[PDB]
Amino acid sequence: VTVKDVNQQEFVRALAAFLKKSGKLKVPEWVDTVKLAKHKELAPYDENWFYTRAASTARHLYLRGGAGVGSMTKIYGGRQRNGVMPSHFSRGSKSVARRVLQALEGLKMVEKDQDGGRKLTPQGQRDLDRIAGQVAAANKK
Amino acid sequence: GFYWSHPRKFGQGSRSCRVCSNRHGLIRKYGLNMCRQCFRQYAKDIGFIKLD
Amino acid sequence: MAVQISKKRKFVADGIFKAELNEFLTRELAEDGYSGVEVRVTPTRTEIIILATRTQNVLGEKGRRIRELTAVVQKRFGFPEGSVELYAEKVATRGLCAIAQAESLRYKLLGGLAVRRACYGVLRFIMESGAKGCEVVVSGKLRGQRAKSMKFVDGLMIHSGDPVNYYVDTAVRHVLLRQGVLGIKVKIMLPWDPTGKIGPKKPLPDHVSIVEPKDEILPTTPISEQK
Amino acid sequence: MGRVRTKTVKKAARVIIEKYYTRLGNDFHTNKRVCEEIAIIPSKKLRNKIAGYVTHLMKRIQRGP
Amino acid sequence: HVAQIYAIRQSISKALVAYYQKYVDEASKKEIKDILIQYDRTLLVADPRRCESKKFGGPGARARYQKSYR
Amino acid sequence: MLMPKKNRIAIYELLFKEGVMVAKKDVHMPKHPELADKNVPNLHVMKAMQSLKSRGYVKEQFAWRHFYWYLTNEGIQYLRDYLHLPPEIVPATLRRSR
Amino acid sequence: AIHRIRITLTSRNVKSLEKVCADLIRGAKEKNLKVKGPVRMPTKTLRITTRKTPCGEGSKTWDRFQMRIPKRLIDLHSPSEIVKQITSISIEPGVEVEVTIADA
RNA sequence: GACAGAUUGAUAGCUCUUUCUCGAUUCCGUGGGUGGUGGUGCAUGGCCGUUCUUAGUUGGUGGAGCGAUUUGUCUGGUUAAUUCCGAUAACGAACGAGACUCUGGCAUGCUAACUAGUUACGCGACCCCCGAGCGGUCGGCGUCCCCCAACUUCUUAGAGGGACAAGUGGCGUUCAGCCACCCGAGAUUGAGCAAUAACAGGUCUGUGAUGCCCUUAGAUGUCCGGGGCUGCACGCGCGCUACACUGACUGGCUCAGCGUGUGCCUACCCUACGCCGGCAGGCGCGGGUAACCCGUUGAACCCCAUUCGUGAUGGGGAUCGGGGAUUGCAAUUAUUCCCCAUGAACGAGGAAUUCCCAGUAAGUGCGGGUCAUAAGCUUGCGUUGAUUAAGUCCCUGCCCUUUGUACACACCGCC
Prior knowledge:
Chain A is built from five helices and four strands.
């Protein structure tokens, strides 16, 4: 039951829980006043993205062998009303995906790969998908 | 020999047609720098053949 | 030098260089019936076969003109000393090339002559040479403040298809006169359909050639033989 | 609707048969490449399109002359 | 997104078809091919279709930039 | 017999040195391949050569904005007598052929 | 030696490129050594789209000016003879030929 | 041809004294140019637009007309298409249509491919419980790859084949064909090419194509600086965004294609990965004549996760307040972008009218083109993908035939 075998959207639900119920990661200060990406209209409601997004980011690295900040920005996109203008694609915030990577690095979920870009390290490779067992075997539903 | 001075370095000041020195509708792409008409003259000779 | 210019941006450049030549060449070897270069790049060298007609004028004083044009192309498109040899050759069957005849008509008028008698003199020739068909158009003002457009035609001519592309020999040339400007348009049809040597495709795709029964003799009684 | 035949076909077809009645038959893909032998049909479309009447005229012939 | 699915549907019906054909049998290949092609949904049949190109003087293939008119 | 002496005396003797002198039609070069001791672009070259043709001691083509300056047989005299150059002279078209 | 030669054949005319391409195979296989046959890259389509009209007007019709450029390439292993034979023969039309030394 | 000031905008000796050099250039007449994005597109070339992707046009011989002319070139069936057959004073031909080219789709058929993919192995592994499993074993991304695996299953692009109203059943003058069905892509996947002959269509400002005309130094020669081309009581033209809850903003998952890219004709990109910053961005550093680097091009709709509750509300999102970046020597005349802040009309549009039938309309981004800076522009590209006609000439406009016609500047006529 790898990250794929678990129905991937109720993965990060529990992986967000993991890193909350650990009580360590390194939550910071641009936090309560963050846009998330110039992309968006409005600061996000669940006051706790980066436990749930570092979840995403970290599992994402599981699926993909290497990923830069430039990559993370790319992936969390959207359309962007410039208003009466047509919608276009704007990269996500770097700062936040970066500090997500650097923070995952603190727990040592991840590491900097060779040839540039972050990938996840064996230790983290665990915490990630350990709970995959726990999410499949939470219950069949 | 002095004064004849600006940016002639970007802007259509700089670039003009290689065939006839006219400075509009200019096929910048692909290192041609022909005016769009000076295509259809010097086009077959170049290689662009109209297929579909 | 270590640019390695792109298989996109490079063939463009050699298409361009091609064009830049075929113009000055046209515009300077005009009176001598330039038909066309075929640019002949090689090791250490860039041959360039000047396919024109009256080679007594491309040579000139003992072979001066050829040496000017070689120097010119050296000094322009960047071909070092002994890296470019022009090679003037006479055109085979000049009737069947268009711009040869179309120029022959810029200069037959320029010389001083009616439209009528001249372009017939051309049209007559190009057919007699060995053409499937041909046409000539002399648009422009013609002994009157108003512009006419004249079109004397002969033989066969296809006027559509891909076929046109490798069969007709189109050629536009202006002509600047003591009055104003006419257009020549020579448009010859090549009968290399009969025998190029292997005429490209040969058939106009419409045209099928059914080779005939040839033998198919004898029903007869059975018989046999041994060998 | 799409396809009624052109006189390059109708004429060549009728003229093959005039000259090779014995060679042809009432199949397509056989007499299809008989036409490659006995003629110089440039395009595959036409080559192939010609064996059109080559059949439609044998189906006629057996029924009537 | 959606295409990828009749793509993978078509694939695991085609593949499964080539399975029972090549080494196994043919009767079950034919009982399969029947069970599928009695309602296709292009299961073993490639949808022959693909998108038209755009032509100048229109947003899509066919439609045209609105005609001014006095 | 005109203009910046240093530059234009060098343009003559360039043209006498060579069979053919190409150019470009562009006032804003400050240079020109071979010679160009200093500046002497189109202008100083053109101004000279477009003199030479009109009086008659050179002949033109144009061909995609460039000027195709070909040296006339009469000019052989005009420029060598301008440059006091030897009565054999041999401009450039010495031309060993075959 | 025997060095890792690549011959990169870039040209516009598919037919007048694959007469040359065949002659390098048949030129090398004459004096046999190795090959890995002609590789076929995607053909690059140099597509320009300009107005038919000089000046302004008329219903807006454009042309669709195209130039193709197919690249073949052929690997081989040889001395400085078989390269300088096979490259200098089978030249002629509008065909560009590259010669890589080895590996990079 | 002139380094400090009067000036002037200018360190323009362009000019008002001084003068110190290049030194045979210079200057002043005359004729004459030389340009001119001056003039004239009813002085022209080319190129384009279109009548008009509409079915038409032409000749050789016959035959008819004294002869312009006419038949051939057509009652009917047919056909996308004077396309065909046939009736047939015509017979057999030529251009247009068609055939062709490009294109688009069937090709476990071939030739191959470290600049594709790779594929699946063999799986030899690292390998962490990434996950299953006591453990054997397995599911799986990643890699360790390389390769002296092996191969082309998809990728690519070469040769090929095929699809051809081909079979059968209707209908049909039982011809030309049409219709239905079989096998299967069913005879039509979509452009380019496009005749005769036209038209004061447009173009002299795409053309070093240019007739003539003007203008020609105080120059309409070329520019610097600024300005305008953007200005605003009104009028129309193509666009976009909305009007919302099959939707709005709040999590998340996750599927490309055509391109495009540096290092380019005179000074200039594509961008991977580090830090910094919210962000614009900034600052680090890396690959890239490219199928290698960008780049499993990691997208939006779309898809999935929570708010909201039909409030001109969270839609919408104009107009201004204020900051901050970036391009540019310079943005005042909001350059472009970001960050704040204000926060409009519109709750489906009055009279009209274009667009089109299958991967079609629509939405939807994305490339390209335009580009220093940069697009609400077009042209391509997928992607999501409907409803409905499958016929008729009812309106508009086109083809033929017969006919009438005082029209032939052709009814926008003539009177």
